[PDB]
C-alpha cells in the first residue's frame, strides 16, 4: 500500500527530470551534468583560474568532500571548463582519504592550502595545510593528518568560517549549542588549547550556522534551532555568555544565514518555516522582508558575489530559487502572479532529490554549481534574456 | 552532459533603485558597536 | 492622462432572512445534520425539514482545479451570497472569494453551509471573474449560504517529506544499496 505512494512519487521525480531536460535549450546558456562516483557533502569554488585563450576556455577549480561508503570518507579536487567570451569536461583528481566524516570543509580565503574540516561524526575540528595534502601518497595505506586538531566542543560541529580579513581566524559552532573562535598563529606545542580565542554559550538549542561578517573582523551571526538569531562581537568581554543581540527571527528551527558580501548591512536567514527572512542591523526589531515560494523546508541560502540584489535559496522540494530583490513593491499583471511574487527571478529544478548544497563560481557571472543527494553535480547559468 | 549557447550601468542602477525603494520602505552596547561601524 | 473608470460597488441586504439564520441558538448548532463528500456528481436531497441548520461538505484538492473539474466551466451558479441548492459548491467557494481560479490550491477544504428557504428572486452578479446567473421564476429546492470555510493544515504527506524526517546520511546509505542491485539498466 505504501509502495503505490513511493513509486508514484519516484515517477514524478523522473517526470520533473525530463520536463526540465526537454526545455533546457530555451532556459540556460550553459549546462554541465556530472555523475560523480560518490555523494558530495560539500563544494567550494576556488578563486585561482587558468585562461587558455588560444585553446579558448578557462578552467576553475573545485574542492569536494565525498563519501565512498560508510567510514570511507574522502576529499577531491576538480577542474572545470568554462567557455570563452573574449576573442569541455569536469575532471576529478587529487583524491585523499579523510580520517573521519566531513559535513563542512571550509578553505581559508587568502590561502587555499588550508581546509578546516568537521563532520557529523566527530567533535574535533581538523585543519589541513600544504604538507598534509602533499605529504600524503595515494599508495599509502593511511589517510592524511591535518595541520592541527582543534577540540573544545563535546558534540560534533555543524559548520566553520574563516575571517576574510583577520589572518588565520576561524569560528566553529557545534551541536552542543556552543561557539568557539580560534586563532592558529597563537599555537603552542604544549598548548593545543592556546588556539582557543573565545568560547561562547549564548544559544539554547543545537546551532545550525555560525558565520562572520564579510568586511569586519569582530562581527558574526549565529542561528539556532530555538528559532533565534544571535549577534556576536568577539571583542566584547561578556561575549562568552552574552551575545551582542538576540532576536526572534522565525517560528521554526533556523538552518542557515548568509551575509551580503557587497553591503555590510543585509543578512538572509532560512528556516524550515519555508520562508526566507531579511535583516538590517540598524533596524533589528523588524523583519526586513519575507520571500515566499517554497512549499516545504528550505535548507540553505547564499548571495551573489557579483551583484548583491541576487539571492539564491535551496529547499527540500528539489528546487533552487533565485530572487532579484530590486522588485519589491512592483506591479505585476494577473497572469504574472502565478509563478509567485514579482521579486522572484528564476527557478531551477533539474535535480531529482534533495539538493545538498550550492556555490557561485566567483570567476563567471550568473553561474552556480549544485551538488545533490543522487550523486549529481550541476553547473548552470540562465540565459541572458531573463536578466540581460 | 554539456549544453553551450554562444551569444553594467543597468545592473548598478537597479541595485540603487533597490536600495532606495527599500530604505524608503524601512522608515545597548550592540547599537554602540554597530554605530561605530556605520557611516 | 488615460481615463480611469471605476466598476461599481455591490451591496447585499440579507436582513429579511434574520429570523432563520438565528432560529436555533448558538451552542446548539454545532453539529451539521449530514455530511457529503463533494464530487461533480453530488446531488443534495430535499431538506425542507431542517431549515435553519447547516451541513458540512468536504472538497478535495483536485476538485478546485479549473482543468480537472469539468463542472467549473459550465458556470452552474444562480444567485449572489445566497444560492439555489443546484449550484456547484466549488463555484460557490470560488465566487464567494475563498480561493482564486488562476492560482492552484494546495489544501483540503471543509465548507459549512446554511439551509435557507427559497427566495423570490436570485440576482446574478460578477465577482472574482465568476458571473453567477439569475433565476427569476420559482425555485423548487432550498437555498444555501456559506457559514464558514476551514482549510486542512495537512492535506497529504508527500513521501519525499516523510523520508525528509529521516537523517541525511542514514537515508543516504539506503540510497547506495538500491543503487547496487537495481536488476536493470
Coordinates of C-alpha atoms in Angstrom, one line a residue:
Chain A
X1 CA 0.0 0.0 0.0
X2 CA 2.9 2.4 0.8
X3 CA 4.7 1.1 -2.4
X4 CA 2.0 2.8 -4.5
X5 CA 2.8 6.2 -3.0
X6 CA 6.5 5.7 -3.1
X7 CA 6.5 4.6 -6.8
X8 CA 4.2 7.4 -7.9
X9 CA 6.5 9.8 -6.1
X10 CA 9.6 8.4 -7.7
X11 CA 7.9 8.6 -11.1
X12 CA 7.0 12.2 -10.8
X13 CA 10.5 12.9 -9.7
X14 CA 11.6 11.3 -13.0
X15 CA 8.8 13.4 -14.6
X16 CA 10.2 16.7 -13.3
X17 CA 13.5 15.4 -14.7
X18 CA 13.0 15.2 -18.4
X19 CA 10.5 18.0 -18.3
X20 CA 13.4 20.1 -17.2
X21 CA 15.7 18.2 -19.6
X22 CA 13.3 18.8 -22.5
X23 CA 13.1 22.6 -22.4
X24 CA 16.7 23.2 -21.3
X25 CA 17.9 24.7 -24.6
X26 CA 15.4 27.6 -24.1
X27 CA 16.4 28.3 -20.4
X28 CA 20.1 28.1 -19.9
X29 CA 23.3 29.3 -21.6
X30 CA 25.3 26.5 -20.0
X31 CA 24.6 23.1 -18.5
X32 CA 27.2 20.5 -17.4
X33 CA 25.8 17.5 -15.6
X34 CA 28.3 15.2 -13.9
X35 CA 27.7 11.8 -12.4
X36 CA 30.5 11.6 -9.9
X37 CA 31.3 8.4 -8.1
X38 CA 30.1 9.4 -4.7
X39 CA 27.8 11.7 -2.7
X40 CA 29.5 15.1 -2.4
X41 CA 28.7 16.5 1.0
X42 CA 30.1 20.0 0.1
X43 CA 31.6 22.2 -2.6
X44 CA 33.6 25.4 -2.6
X45 CA 34.8 27.3 -5.6
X46 CA 38.5 28.2 -6.0
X47 CA 39.5 31.8 -6.7
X48 CA 42.5 30.9 -8.8
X49 CA 41.8 30.5 -12.5
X50 CA 43.5 29.4 -15.8
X51 CA 42.7 31.1 -19.0
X52 CA 43.6 29.2 -22.2
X53 CA 42.7 31.9 -24.7
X54 CA 44.3 30.3 -27.8
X55 CA 42.7 27.0 -26.9
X56 CA 39.7 29.0 -25.9
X57 CA 38.4 28.4 -22.4
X58 CA 39.0 28.9 -18.7
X59 CA 39.5 26.2 -16.0
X60 CA 38.4 26.8 -12.5
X61 CA 39.0 24.5 -9.5
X62 CA 36.6 22.9 -7.0
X63 CA 37.1 21.2 -3.7
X64 CA 34.7 18.3 -2.8
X65 CA 34.4 16.1 0.2
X66 CA 32.5 12.9 -0.6
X67 CA 31.7 9.6 1.0
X68 CA 32.7 6.5 -0.9
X69 CA 30.7 4.5 1.7
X70 CA 30.3 4.4 5.5
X71 CA 33.6 5.2 7.0
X72 CA 35.2 5.7 3.6
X73 CA 35.2 9.5 3.7
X74 CA 37.4 11.3 1.2
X75 CA 38.3 14.6 -0.4
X76 CA 39.0 15.6 -4.0
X77 CA 39.8 18.5 -6.4
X78 CA 38.1 19.1 -9.7
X79 CA 38.9 21.2 -12.8
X80 CA 36.0 22.8 -14.6
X81 CA 35.9 24.1 -18.2
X82 CA 34.0 27.3 -18.8
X83 CA 33.7 28.7 -22.4
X84 CA 35.4 31.9 -23.5
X85 CA 33.8 35.2 -24.5
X86 CA 36.8 37.4 -25.4
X87 CA 38.1 36.6 -28.9
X88 CA 34.6 20.8 -22.2
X89 CA 34.7 18.4 -19.3
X90 CA 34.7 18.1 -15.5
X91 CA 37.9 16.5 -14.4
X92 CA 38.2 14.8 -11.0
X93 CA 41.6 14.2 -9.4
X94 CA 43.6 14.8 -6.1
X95 CA 41.6 12.2 -4.0
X96 CA 42.8 11.9 -0.4
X97 CA 41.1 9.8 2.2
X98 CA 40.0 11.7 5.4
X99 CA 40.2 10.2 8.9
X100 CA 36.5 10.8 9.7
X101 CA 33.4 12.5 8.4
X102 CA 33.0 15.8 6.6
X103 CA 29.9 17.9 7.0
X104 CA 31.6 21.2 6.3
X105 CA 35.0 21.8 4.8
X106 CA 36.0 25.4 4.5
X107 CA 39.2 26.7 2.9
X108 CA 40.9 29.9 4.2
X109 CA 40.1 32.8 1.8
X110 CA 43.7 34.2 1.4
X111 CA 45.3 30.7 1.4
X112 CA 43.8 27.8 -0.4
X113 CA 46.2 25.2 1.1
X114 CA 44.4 25.1 4.5
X115 CA 41.0 23.5 4.9
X116 CA 39.1 23.2 8.2
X117 CA 37.0 20.0 8.1
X118 CA 34.4 18.8 10.5
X119 CA 31.7 16.2 10.2
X120 CA 28.5 14.9 11.8
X121 CA 30.6 12.0 13.3
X122 CA 33.2 13.8 15.5
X123 CA 33.5 16.9 17.7
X124 CA 37.1 17.6 16.7
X125 CA 38.0 20.2 14.0
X126 CA 40.8 19.0 11.7
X127 CA 42.6 21.7 9.8
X128 CA 44.8 20.6 6.8
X129 CA 47.7 22.5 5.1
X130 CA 50.2 22.2 2.3
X131 CA 52.3 19.5 3.7
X132 CA 49.3 17.3 4.8
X133 CA 48.0 17.1 1.3
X134 CA 51.4 16.9 -0.4
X135 CA 52.9 14.5 2.2
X136 CA 50.1 12.1 1.5
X137 CA 50.7 9.5 -1.2
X138 CA 47.7 7.6 -2.6
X139 CA 49.8 4.4 -2.5
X140 CA 50.0 4.7 1.3
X141 CA 47.6 2.7 3.5
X142 CA 46.8 5.6 5.9
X143 CA 44.8 8.8 5.4
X144 CA 46.1 12.3 5.9
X145 CA 46.7 14.0 9.2
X146 CA 45.6 17.7 9.4
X147 CA 47.8 20.6 10.3
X148 CA 46.1 20.9 13.7
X149 CA 43.4 19.3 15.9
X150 CA 41.1 21.8 17.5
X151 CA 38.9 20.5 20.3
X152 CA 36.8 22.4 22.8
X153 CA 33.3 21.1 21.9
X154 CA 31.7 17.9 23.2
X155 CA 29.2 17.4 20.3
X156 CA 30.1 17.4 16.6
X157 CA 30.5 20.8 15.0
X158 CA 28.0 21.9 12.3
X159 CA 30.0 24.5 10.4
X160 CA 33.0 26.8 10.4
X161 CA 34.0 30.1 8.9
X162 CA 37.3 31.9 8.4
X163 CA 37.8 35.6 8.9
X164 CA 38.1 37.2 5.4
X165 CA 40.5 39.9 6.8
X166 CA 41.8 38.7 10.2
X167 CA 44.6 36.4 9.2
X168 CA 44.0 32.9 10.4
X169 CA 40.9 33.5 12.5
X170 CA 38.2 30.8 12.5
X171 CA 34.9 30.0 14.1
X172 CA 33.2 26.7 14.9
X173 CA 29.6 26.3 16.1
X174 CA 28.6 22.9 17.2
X175 CA 25.7 20.6 18.2
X176 CA 26.1 21.2 22.0
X177 CA 24.9 24.8 21.4
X178 CA 28.3 26.5 21.9
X179 CA 30.6 28.7 19.8
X180 CA 34.4 28.9 19.5
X181 CA 36.6 31.5 17.8
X182 CA 40.0 30.1 17.0
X183 CA 43.5 31.7 16.3
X184 CA 46.1 29.4 14.7
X185 CA 49.1 31.8 14.9
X186 CA 48.7 31.6 18.7
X187 CA 49.6 27.9 18.9
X188 CA 51.8 26.3 21.4
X189 CA 53.1 22.7 21.0
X190 CA 52.4 22.4 24.8
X191 CA 49.1 24.2 24.5
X192 CA 46.8 23.0 21.7
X193 CA 44.2 25.0 23.7
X194 CA 46.0 28.3 23.1
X195 CA 44.3 28.3 19.7
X196 CA 41.1 28.9 21.7
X197 CA 40.5 32.6 21.4
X198 CA 36.9 32.5 22.7
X199 CA 34.2 30.0 23.5
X200 CA 30.6 31.3 23.8
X201 CA 27.4 29.9 25.3
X202 CA 24.7 32.1 24.0
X203 CA 22.5 29.6 22.2
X204 CA 19.8 27.4 23.8
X205 CA 19.2 24.7 21.1
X206 CA 21.6 22.9 18.7
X207 CA 23.3 25.5 16.5
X208 CA 22.9 25.2 12.7
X209 CA 25.1 28.0 11.5
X210 CA 27.7 30.4 12.8
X211 CA 29.4 32.8 10.3
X212 CA 31.4 36.0 10.2
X213 CA 30.9 39.4 8.5
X214 CA 32.4 39.8 5.0
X215 CA 34.1 43.1 5.7
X216 CA 34.5 43.1 9.5
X217 CA 36.7 41.1 11.9
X218 CA 34.6 41.5 15.0
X219 CA 31.0 40.8 13.8
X220 CA 29.5 37.4 13.4
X221 CA 26.0 35.9 13.5
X222 CA 24.7 32.6 14.9
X223 CA 21.4 30.9 14.3
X224 CA 19.9 28.1 16.3
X225 CA 17.0 25.6 16.3
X226 CA 15.3 27.6 19.0
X227 CA 14.1 30.0 16.3
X228 CA 16.6 32.6 17.3
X229 CA 19.2 34.8 15.7
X230 CA 22.1 35.9 17.9
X231 CA 24.6 38.6 17.0
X232 CA 28.1 38.2 18.4
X233 CA 31.1 40.5 18.6
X234 CA 34.1 38.7 19.9
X235 CA 36.0 41.7 21.4
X236 CA 33.1 42.1 23.8
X237 CA 34.3 40.8 27.2
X238 CA 30.8 39.4 28.2
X239 CA 30.6 37.7 24.8
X240 CA 31.4 34.3 26.4
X241 CA 27.9 34.2 27.8
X242 CA 26.2 37.4 26.5
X243 CA 25.6 37.9 22.7
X244 CA 25.5 41.3 21.2
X245 CA 21.9 40.8 20.2
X246 CA 19.1 38.2 20.3
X247 CA 16.1 38.3 18.0
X248 CA 13.1 36.0 17.3
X249 CA 13.6 35.7 13.6
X250 CA 11.4 32.7 12.7
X251 CA 9.0 30.2 14.2
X252 CA 10.9 27.1 13.1
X253 CA 14.4 25.8 13.6
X254 CA 16.8 28.0 11.6
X255 CA 19.1 26.3 9.2
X256 CA 21.5 28.9 7.7
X257 CA 22.3 32.6 7.5
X258 CA 24.1 34.4 4.6
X259 CA 25.9 37.7 4.8
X260 CA 25.7 40.2 1.9
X261 CA 29.2 40.4 0.5
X262 CA 28.9 43.9 -1.0
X263 CA 26.7 45.5 1.6
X264 CA 27.6 45.2 5.2
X265 CA 24.0 45.7 6.4
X266 CA 21.9 42.9 4.9
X267 CA 21.8 39.3 6.1
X268 CA 19.4 36.5 5.0
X269 CA 18.0 33.7 7.1
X270 CA 16.4 30.4 6.2
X271 CA 14.3 28.1 8.3
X272 CA 12.1 25.0 8.0
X273 CA 9.2 27.5 8.0
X274 CA 9.5 27.6 4.2
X275 CA 10.1 31.4 4.4
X276 CA 13.3 33.5 3.8
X277 CA 13.8 36.4 6.1
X278 CA 15.9 39.5 5.5
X279 CA 17.7 41.5 8.2
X280 CA 19.2 45.0 8.5
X281 CA 21.4 45.8 11.6
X282 CA 20.1 49.3 12.3
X283 CA 16.5 48.1 12.4
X284 CA 16.6 44.7 14.2
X285 CA 13.1 45.0 15.8
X286 CA 11.5 44.2 12.4
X287 CA 11.9 41.5 9.8
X288 CA 13.1 43.4 6.7
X289 CA 11.1 41.2 4.3
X290 CA 9.9 37.7 3.7
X291 CA 10.3 35.8 0.4
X292 CA 7.7 33.1 -0.3
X293 CA 7.6 30.3 -2.8
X294 CA 9.0 27.1 -1.3
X295 CA 6.2 24.8 0.0
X296 CA 8.3 22.7 2.3
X297 CA 11.6 23.0 4.3
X298 CA 14.2 25.4 2.9
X299 CA 17.7 24.4 3.9
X300 CA 20.3 26.8 2.7
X301 CA 20.9 30.2 1.1
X302 CA 23.6 32.3 -0.5
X303 CA 24.2 35.8 -2.0
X304 CA 25.8 36.5 -5.4
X305 CA 29.4 37.7 -5.0
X306 CA 29.0 39.9 -8.1
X307 CA 25.6 41.7 -7.6
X308 CA 24.0 42.0 -4.1
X309 CA 20.3 42.1 -5.2
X310 CA 20.5 38.4 -6.3
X311 CA 19.9 35.8 -3.6
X312 CA 19.8 32.0 -4.1
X313 CA 17.9 29.6 -1.9
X314 CA 17.7 25.8 -1.9
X315 CA 15.0 23.7 -0.4
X316 CA 13.7 20.1 0.0
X317 CA 11.2 20.3 -2.8
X318 CA 14.1 19.8 -5.3
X319 CA 14.1 23.5 -6.5
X320 CA 16.6 26.3 -6.2
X321 CA 15.1 29.8 -6.5
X322 CA 16.9 33.0 -7.5
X323 CA 15.4 36.3 -6.3
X324 CA 16.2 39.7 -7.7
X325 CA 15.3 41.9 -4.7
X326 CA 15.1 45.1 -6.8
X327 CA 11.4 44.2 -7.4
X328 CA 9.9 45.0 -4.0
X329 CA 6.6 46.7 -4.3
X330 CA 6.4 46.5 -8.1
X331 CA 3.3 45.9 -10.2
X332 CA 2.6 42.5 -11.8
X333 CA -0.1 41.5 -14.3
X334 CA -2.7 39.0 -13.3
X335 CA -1.1 36.1 -15.1
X336 CA 2.3 37.2 -13.8
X337 CA 1.2 36.4 -10.2
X338 CA 1.0 32.6 -10.9
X339 CA 4.7 31.9 -10.6
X340 CA 4.9 33.9 -7.3
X341 CA 5.7 37.4 -6.1
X342 CA 7.4 39.6 -8.8
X343 CA 10.7 39.7 -6.8
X344 CA 11.1 36.0 -7.7
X345 CA 13.5 35.8 -10.7
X346 CA 14.4 32.2 -11.6
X347 CA 13.7 28.6 -10.6
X348 CA 15.9 25.6 -11.4
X349 CA 14.8 22.0 -10.8
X350 CA 17.0 19.8 -13.0
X351 CA 17.8 17.6 -10.0
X352 CA 16.0 14.5 -8.8
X353 CA 16.4 14.6 -5.0
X354 CA 17.2 17.0 -2.1
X355 CA 20.0 19.3 -3.4
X356 CA 22.8 19.0 -0.9
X357 CA 24.5 22.4 -1.5
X358 CA 25.4 25.2 -3.9
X359 CA 28.2 27.6 -4.6
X360 CA 28.7 30.5 -7.0
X361 CA 31.6 30.4 -9.3
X362 CA 33.2 33.8 -8.5
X363 CA 35.1 34.0 -11.8
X364 CA 32.0 33.8 -14.0
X365 CA 28.7 35.7 -13.6
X366 CA 25.3 34.2 -13.2
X367 CA 26.8 30.7 -12.8
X368 CA 26.3 28.3 -10.0
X369 CA 27.3 24.7 -9.1
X370 CA 24.9 22.5 -7.1
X371 CA 25.6 19.0 -5.6
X372 CA 22.6 16.8 -4.9
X373 CA 21.7 13.7 -2.9
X374 CA 21.6 11.5 -6.0
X375 CA 25.4 11.7 -6.8
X376 CA 24.8 14.5 -9.3
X377 CA 26.6 17.8 -9.9
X378 CA 25.1 20.7 -11.9
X379 CA 26.9 23.6 -13.4
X380 CA 24.4 26.0 -14.7
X381 CA 23.8 29.7 -15.7
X382 CA 20.5 31.0 -17.1
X383 CA 20.1 32.8 -20.4
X384 CA 20.9 36.4 -20.8
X385 CA 17.4 37.1 -21.9
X386 CA 15.9 36.9 -18.4
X387 CA 18.4 39.4 -16.9
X388 CA 20.1 41.0 -19.9
Chain B
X1 CA 26.5 16.3 -20.4
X2 CA 27.3 19.8 -21.7
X3 CA 25.0 22.5 -23.4
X4 CA 26.6 25.7 -24.7
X5 CA 24.9 28.8 -26.3
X6 CA 27.3 31.3 -27.8
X7 CA 25.7 34.8 -27.9
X8 CA 26.9 47.3 -16.4
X9 CA 25.2 50.6 -15.6
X10 CA 21.8 48.9 -15.8
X11 CA 22.7 46.4 -13.0
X12 CA 24.1 49.1 -10.8
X13 CA 21.1 51.4 -11.3
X14 CA 18.7 48.5 -10.5
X15 CA 20.8 47.9 -7.4
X16 CA 20.5 51.6 -6.5
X17 CA 16.7 51.5 -7.0
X18 CA 16.6 48.5 -4.8
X19 CA 18.5 50.4 -2.1
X20 CA 16.3 53.5 -2.4
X21 CA 12.9 51.9 -2.5
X22 CA 13.7 49.5 0.2
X23 CA 15.1 52.2 2.5
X24 CA 12.1 54.4 1.8
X25 CA 10.1 51.4 2.9
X26 CA 12.1 51.0 6.1
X27 CA 11.3 54.3 7.8
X28 CA 22.5 48.5 24.5
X29 CA 26.2 48.1 23.5
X30 CA 25.0 46.4 20.3
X31 CA 23.9 49.6 18.8
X32 CA 27.1 51.1 20.1
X33 CA 29.2 48.6 18.1
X34 CA 27.0 49.0 15.0
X35 CA 27.0 52.8 15.1
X36 CA 30.8 52.6 15.4
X37 CA 30.6 50.6 12.2
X38 CA 28.0 52.7 10.4
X39 CA 28.8 55.6 8.1
Chain C
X1 CA -3.7 61.1 -18.8
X2 CA -5.8 58.0 -19.6
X3 CA -9.4 58.0 -18.4
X4 CA -9.9 55.7 -15.4
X5 CA -13.3 54.2 -14.9
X6 CA -14.4 52.5 -11.7
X7 CA -16.6 49.4 -11.7
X8 CA -19.4 49.9 -9.2
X9 CA -19.9 48.7 -5.6
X10 CA -22.1 45.8 -4.7
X11 CA -24.3 45.8 -1.6
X12 CA -26.1 42.8 -0.1
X13 CA -29.0 43.1 2.3
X14 CA -29.7 39.7 3.9
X15 CA -31.8 41.3 6.6
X16 CA -35.2 39.5 5.9
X17 CA -33.5 36.1 6.4
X18 CA -32.6 37.1 10.0
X19 CA -35.4 35.1 11.7
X20 CA -34.0 32.0 10.0
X21 CA -30.2 32.5 10.5
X22 CA -30.9 32.9 14.2
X23 CA -33.7 30.3 14.6
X24 CA -31.6 27.9 16.6
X25 CA -29.3 29.5 19.2
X26 CA -25.5 29.2 19.3
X27 CA -24.1 26.3 21.3
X28 CA -26.9 24.2 19.8
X29 CA -25.9 24.5 16.2
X30 CA -22.5 22.8 16.5
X31 CA -23.1 19.5 14.5
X32 CA -24.1 19.5 10.9
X33 CA -27.1 17.3 10.1
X34 CA -25.4 15.3 7.4
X35 CA -22.0 15.4 5.6
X36 CA -21.2 15.0 2.0
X37 CA -18.0 14.4 0.0
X38 CA -18.0 16.8 -2.9
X39 CA -17.8 15.4 -6.4
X40 CA -19.1 16.9 -9.6
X41 CA -21.9 14.3 -9.4
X42 CA -23.2 15.2 -5.9
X43 CA -26.9 16.0 -5.5
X44 CA -28.3 17.1 -2.2
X45 CA -31.7 15.7 -1.2
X46 CA -34.6 18.0 -0.4
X47 CA -34.0 19.4 3.1
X48 CA -37.2 21.2 3.9
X49 CA -37.5 19.7 7.4
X50 CA -34.2 21.2 8.6
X51 CA -34.3 24.8 7.5
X52 CA -32.1 26.9 9.7
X53 CA -29.4 24.3 10.3
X54 CA -26.1 23.7 8.5
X55 CA -24.4 21.0 6.5
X56 CA -20.7 20.1 6.1
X57 CA -19.2 19.5 2.7
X58 CA -15.6 18.3 2.2
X59 CA -13.8 19.2 -1.0
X60 CA -10.5 17.6 -2.1
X61 CA -7.6 19.4 -3.7
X62 CA -8.0 18.2 -7.2
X63 CA -11.6 19.4 -7.5
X64 CA -10.6 23.1 -7.1
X65 CA -8.7 23.0 -10.4
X66 CA -10.1 24.6 -13.5
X67 CA -8.6 21.9 -15.6
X68 CA -9.7 18.7 -13.7
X69 CA -13.2 19.8 -12.6
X70 CA -15.5 19.7 -15.7
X71 CA -18.4 21.4 -13.9
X72 CA -16.3 24.5 -13.2
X73 CA -16.6 25.8 -16.8
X74 CA -20.4 25.4 -17.4
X75 CA -20.9 28.2 -14.8
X76 CA -23.6 26.5 -12.8
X77 CA -24.4 29.0 -10.1
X78 CA -27.5 31.0 -9.5
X79 CA -27.7 33.9 -7.1
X80 CA -25.4 36.2 -5.1
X81 CA -24.4 35.4 -1.5
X82 CA -27.4 33.1 -1.2
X83 CA -27.6 30.4 -3.9
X84 CA -30.0 27.8 -5.1
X85 CA -29.3 24.3 -3.9
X86 CA -28.5 23.3 -7.5
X87 CA -25.3 25.4 -7.5
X88 CA -21.9 23.8 -7.7
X89 CA -20.3 24.2 -4.4
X90 CA -16.8 24.6 -5.9
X91 CA -18.2 27.6 -7.8
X92 CA -19.7 28.9 -4.6
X93 CA -16.3 28.9 -2.9
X94 CA -14.6 30.4 -5.9
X95 CA -17.3 33.1 -6.3
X96 CA -17.7 33.9 -2.6
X97 CA -13.9 34.6 -2.7
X98 CA -12.3 31.8 -0.7
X99 CA -9.7 30.9 -3.3
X100 CA -8.5 32.1 -6.8
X101 CA -9.1 30.2 -10.0
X102 CA -5.8 31.2 -11.6
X103 CA -3.5 30.1 -8.7
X104 CA -3.8 26.4 -7.8
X105 CA -4.8 25.5 -4.3
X106 CA -2.9 23.0 -2.0
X107 CA -5.2 22.1 0.9
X108 CA -8.4 20.2 1.6
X109 CA -11.5 22.4 2.2
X110 CA -14.2 21.9 4.8
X111 CA -17.2 24.1 4.0
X112 CA -20.2 24.6 6.3
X113 CA -23.3 25.9 4.6
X114 CA -26.6 27.2 5.9
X115 CA -30.0 25.9 4.8
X116 CA -32.4 28.7 3.8
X117 CA -36.0 28.9 2.5
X118 CA -36.4 29.6 -1.2
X119 CA -36.2 33.2 -2.4
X120 CA -38.4 35.2 -4.6
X121 CA -35.5 36.3 -6.9
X122 CA -31.9 35.2 -7.4
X123 CA -29.7 38.0 -8.5
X124 CA -26.6 37.3 -10.6
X125 CA -23.5 39.4 -10.2
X126 CA -19.9 39.2 -11.5
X127 CA -17.2 38.8 -8.9
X128 CA -13.7 37.2 -8.9
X129 CA -14.2 36.6 -12.6
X130 CA -17.2 34.4 -11.9
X131 CA -20.6 35.5 -13.3
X132 CA -23.3 33.8 -11.4
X133 CA -26.6 33.6 -13.3
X134 CA -30.0 34.7 -12.2
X135 CA -33.3 32.9 -11.6
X136 CA -36.5 34.9 -11.8
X137 CA -39.1 32.1 -11.8
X138 CA -40.0 30.0 -8.7
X139 CA -37.3 27.7 -7.3
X140 CA -38.2 24.3 -6.0
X141 CA -35.2 23.4 -3.9
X142 CA -33.9 25.4 -0.9
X143 CA -31.1 27.9 -0.6
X144 CA -27.6 27.6 0.8
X145 CA -25.3 30.3 2.3
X146 CA -21.7 29.8 3.4
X147 CA -21.5 29.5 7.2
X148 CA -17.7 29.1 7.4
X149 CA -14.7 27.7 5.4
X150 CA -11.9 25.9 7.1
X151 CA -8.8 24.7 5.4
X152 CA -6.9 21.5 6.4
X153 CA -3.4 22.2 7.9
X154 CA -2.2 18.9 6.5
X155 CA -4.0 17.6 3.3
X156 CA -1.5 14.9 2.1
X157 CA 2.0 13.6 3.0
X158 CA 4.5 13.8 0.1
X159 CA 6.9 10.9 0.6
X160 CA 10.0 13.0 0.0
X161 CA 8.9 14.7 3.2
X162 CA 8.3 11.5 5.2
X163 CA 11.8 10.5 4.2
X164 CA 12.8 14.0 4.9
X165 CA 12.1 13.1 8.5
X166 CA 15.0 10.6 8.3
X167 CA 18.6 11.8 8.7
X168 CA 20.6 12.7 5.6
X169 CA 23.4 10.2 5.9
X170 CA 21.2 7.3 7.2
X171 CA 18.7 7.6 4.4
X172 CA 21.6 8.2 2.1
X173 CA 23.1 4.8 3.0
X174 CA 19.9 3.0 1.8
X175 CA 20.3 5.1 -1.3
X176 CA 23.6 3.3 -2.1
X177 CA 22.1 -0.1 -1.5
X178 CA 19.3 0.4 -4.1
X179 CA 22.0 1.6 -6.5
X180 CA 23.6 -1.8 -6.2
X181 CA 21.2 -4.5 -7.3
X182 CA 18.8 -2.5 -9.5
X183 CA 18.1 -5.6 -11.6
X184 CA 18.2 -3.5 -14.9
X185 CA 19.8 -0.6 -16.7

